Design a protein around this nucleic acid. Structure first.
Ligand SMILES: [Ca+2]
Length: 138
DNA sequence: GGTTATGAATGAAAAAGC
DNA sequence: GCTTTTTCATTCATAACC
């Protein structure tokens, strides 16, 4: 039972609305529920979204007040050309199967470009990075 | 300056072993 | 088929890395 990491705005939103999403989608597993929670979080307006950011701020403040000494712990030329190519392909994946493509369509996308994405975690990260970057500019 | 990797909560699905 | 352990989907914050 070490000192945990404080919840962000989304993890607070997930803690509250996860049981409601599972009620409205009972034949879809928890990993798919996480895809729905993220879809709802993007759908919120600045009014309701700021409510959870303000709630996440107080959690961080109380966390430092309770744990004052806690610390947050954890080809070169063709590298940028590769990264730009990876983001462009994930852009096509979203416009072809939605921003939260099914695990099947995501797996088939990985195999179609198995050379560009040498692993599943490399593709999933790029799916999350590109999607989150589009939503901040909306 | 830009990118990668991590851990926060939660829980069905999978793996392990029986 | 059961119980217990391990996977992993999600955004955000962010240190570690390049
Ligand atoms: Ca078995």
């Amino acid at each position: 039972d070490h000192i945990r990491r404080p919840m962000n705005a989304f993890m607070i939103f997930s803690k509250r609305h996860r049981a409601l999403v599972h009620q409205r989608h009972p034949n879809q597993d928890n990993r798919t529920v996480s895809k729905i929670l993220g879809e709802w979080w993007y759908a919120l307006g600045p009014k309701e979204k700021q409510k959870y950011h303000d709630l996440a701020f107080q959690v961080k403040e109380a966390h430092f007040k309770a744990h004052p000494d806690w610390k947050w712990c954890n080809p070169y030329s063709s590298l940028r050309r590769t990264l730009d190519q990876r983001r462009a392909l994930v852009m096509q994946l979203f416009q072809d199967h939605g921003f939260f493509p099914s695990a099947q369509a995501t797996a088939a996308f990985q195999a179609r470009y198995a050379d560009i994405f040498p692993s599943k975690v490399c593709l999933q990260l790029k799916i999350r990075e590109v999607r989150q970057k589009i939503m901040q500019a909306a």
